[PDB]
Design a binder for these strands. Structure first.
Ligand SMILES: [Cl-]
Ligand code: NA
Ligand code: NA
Ligand code: NA
Ligand code: NA
Lengths: 216, 460
DNA sequence: GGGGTTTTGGGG
DNA sequence: GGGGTTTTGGCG
DNA sequence: GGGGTTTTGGGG
């Protein structure tokens, strides 16, 4: 039994080809989480790991409407309750986005959240980046392994085996090792991208814009 | 500079004091706020190293050293227990019953590290020789001076350190927790275990497979840059780990930025006994093979003992730099790790072909013996951490006509169209090789631009 | 000059 | 000091 | 006081 709500959610999303509709329904309940940081990075925890929630322009306007005396960028150490949310997979540059792995990211799309101002939460372990977890990184590698294997078994055909003579009697034979490089898929670039999941799309606000909207 | 022994330093002077000591423990240097870095360590010397032994339990006694700095680079990175540190201008005080030496490096204090063994850890990793036996391999500030009179202190403390580590555990049982009791700890704890395996999880992370005296196996992530000295078969002490309650598929230890992984000097009695006592375990691997999806990595092969000391080469270097790198161009034999994405030919029955040593041609045995000597002609399409993101797959051959890799499958070549037993064993090995989380550790020989497997055998 | 530190104004 | 950063958010 | 430095006698 997974104790980390975030880990269980994000894990099922990946184990279900990024199809949020295929993830258990008994997991799509409101999320009460602690706000570890709010700027420059808004990070929330579930008692074990921290993730970066992505707010829609609607979600914030609603917030600012029901809570005029509350600035989001100042919710650090405070608790919030995400009533309406969704999860989707996105392709990113993990070299720049620390909340991702292997150029893949599972995003927590927040549609509506309520700030339970001044609610003290139970003592927990120090929260760690879910995308740095051993099991979760492995879960993601499994995901890519499957997509890679399917592409390779579709792209590679005809058993083009190196002719045995090339490796036999190679006394007077010299070759370049790049002769062993085989393309994994029909991908356009030098990066594998032949995935079957349909990359989710949803406009989200940059934590910086919400900072200006509350303090130019 | 006048050097004082730990137990004799003044607790009332509050004046800057200096000393030479042996490091037995240390956190990694870590940031505390917007302007401060800290490194805490445990030190001992001929006058302070063991608690009143009678009802003490041969527990180690020691002083603590806390170094403060404004920059990460002004603090010592301790990779190994047993080495020596020289401190200048430290203030001593009693902190909860023990002698605490404090030194602000950002002010007037300084430190210097001296290798107890021939080479420092970093020098061993780079196969470098030490300038001399009186040269600090690391130190704070731009200069370090060693006066002629110090040489005796250093030489003697080294001799003492070796006698100490060879006679006592140094890291006594009260300084760590048995892995099989890790889940009973309230917070963090320390570990002393043997590294059974170093699995490259990705470009910046190693996954260590650990096993301690209690027989429990745990995994933990070890950043490559932070801990470049991790080696299979070696015993280390891990300063500060927590039990991961969220890992259900396998036992995992969580490390923090201040956590440290430390090896022992050659003379360590504890390290020697543990290297011999703790034996490799494959129970986790055997169990994982029964699952459709294992979150645990499984190295399916082992290389001949004569290669165990051979360094590994990534697929990136092997296929993308072996024709342009001076060092790679001079070698014909390499060791590497990878996972198999696909195996050709697809029909396992065609893995063994008849070979004619006169025409250098091979053929299908579906027509029987009329093709010559039986050999394996298998082509693995592989990938690894270094090439994980690119759109490539690489060819690794298993062509045994000349004897290279003949015993890879623990199955002598034979007509798979007729020998059901041989066919079935190979079909099972095939499912294992292409299964997620299965990896291969192998030595390869470069021949006419291609890499052929040799001196490597499946162990499952 | 400026740190840390305590010398709290002044050495070399 | 047996600890919790980040222009470093996969040495810190 | 004492570093490293240049301020080369004096701030906070
Ligand atoms: Cl060649
Ligand atoms: Na001054
Ligand atoms: Na002063
Ligand atoms: Na001065
Ligand atoms: Na001056």
């Amino acid at each position: 039994q997974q104790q980390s709500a975030f880990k269980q959610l994000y894990t099922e999303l990946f184990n279900n080809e990024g199809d949020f509709s295929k993830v258990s329904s008994n997991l799509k309940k409101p999320l009460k989480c602690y706000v570890k940081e709010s700027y420059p990075h808004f990070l929330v925890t579930d008692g074990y790991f921290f993730v970066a929630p992505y707010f829609t322009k609607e979600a914030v306007n609603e917030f600012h409407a029901k809570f005029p005396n509350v600035n989001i960028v100042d919710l650090t150490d405070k608790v919030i309750v995400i009533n309406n949310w969704s999860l989707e997979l996105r392709r990113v540059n993990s070299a720049e986005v620390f909340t991702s792995y292997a150029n893949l990211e599972a995003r927590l799309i927040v549609h509506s959240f309520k700030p339970n101002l001044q609610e003290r939460l139970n003592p927990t372990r120090y929260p760690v980046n879910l995308f740095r977890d051993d099991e979760f990184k492995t879960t993601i590698q499994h995901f890519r392994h499957t997509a890679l294997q399917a592409a390779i078994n579709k792209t590679v055909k005809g058993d083009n085996l190196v002719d045995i003579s090339k490796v036999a009697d190679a006394a007077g034979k010299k070759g370049k090792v790049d002769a062993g490089i085989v393309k994994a898929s029909a991908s356009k670039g030098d990066e594998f991208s032949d995935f079957s999941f349909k990359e989710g799309n949803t406009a989200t606000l940059k934590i910086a814009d919400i900072f200006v909207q509350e303090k130019g | 500079y006048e050097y004082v022994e730990l137990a004799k330093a003044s607790l009332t002077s509050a004046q800057p004091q200096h000393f030479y000591a042996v490091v037995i423990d240390a956190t990694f240097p870590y940031k505390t706020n917007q302007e401060r870095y800290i490194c805490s360590l445990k030190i001992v010397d001929p006058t302070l190293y063991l608690k009143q032994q009678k009802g003490a339990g041969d527990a180690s006694d020691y002083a603590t050293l806390v170094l403060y700095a404004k920059r990460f680079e002004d603090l010592p990175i301790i990779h190994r227990a047993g080495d020596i540190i020289r401190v200048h201008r430290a203030t001593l005080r009693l902190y909860n019953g023990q002698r605490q030496f404090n030194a602000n490096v950002f002010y007037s204090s300084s430190w210097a590290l001296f290798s107890t063994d021939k080479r420092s850890v970093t020098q061993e990793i780079n196969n470098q020789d030490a300038v001399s036996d009186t040269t600090p391999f690391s130190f704070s500030s731009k200069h370090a001076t060693i006066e002629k009179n110090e040489i005796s202190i250093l030489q003697n403390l080294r001799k003492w350190a070796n006698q100490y580590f060879s006679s006592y555990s140094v890291i006594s049982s009260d300084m760590y927790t048995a892995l099989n009791k890790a889940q009973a700890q309230k917070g963090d704890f320390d570990v002393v275990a043997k590294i059974l395996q170093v699995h490259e999880l990705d470009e910046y992370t190693n996954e260590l497979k650990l096993k301690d005296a209690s027989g429990q196996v745990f995994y933990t992530l070890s950043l490559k840059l932070k801990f470049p000295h991790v080696r299979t078969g070696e015993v280390v002490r891990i300063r500060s780990a927590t039990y991961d309650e969220t890992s259900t598929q396998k036992k995992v230890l969580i490390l923090s930025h201040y956590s440290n992984i430390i090896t022992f000097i050659q003379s360590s009695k504890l390290a020697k006994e543990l290297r011999a006592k703790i034996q490799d375990d494959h129970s986790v691997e055997v169990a994982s093979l029964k699952k459709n999806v294992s979150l645990n990595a499984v190295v399916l092969t082992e290389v001949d003992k004569k290669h165990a000391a051979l360094p590994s080469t990534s697929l990136q270097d092997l296929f993308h730099h072996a024709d342009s790198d001076k060092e790679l161009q001079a070698q014909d034999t390499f060791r590497t790790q990878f996972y198999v994405t696909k195996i050709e030919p697809s029909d396992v029955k065609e893995w063994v072909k008849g070979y004619d040593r006169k025409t250098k041609k091979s053929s299908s045995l579906k027509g029987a013996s009329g093709k010559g000597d039986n050999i394996f002609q298998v082509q693995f399409l592989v990938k690894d951490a270094s090439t994980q993101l690119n759109n490539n797959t690489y060819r690794v051959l298993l062509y045994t006509q000349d004897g290279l890799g003949a015993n890879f499958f623990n199955v002598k070549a034979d007509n798979l169209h007729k020998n059901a037993d041989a066919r079935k064993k190979l079909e099972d090995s095939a499912e294992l090789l292409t299964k997620f989380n299965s990896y291969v550790d192998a030595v390869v020989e470069r021949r006419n631009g291609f890499y052929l497997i040799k001196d490597t055998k499946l162990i499952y």
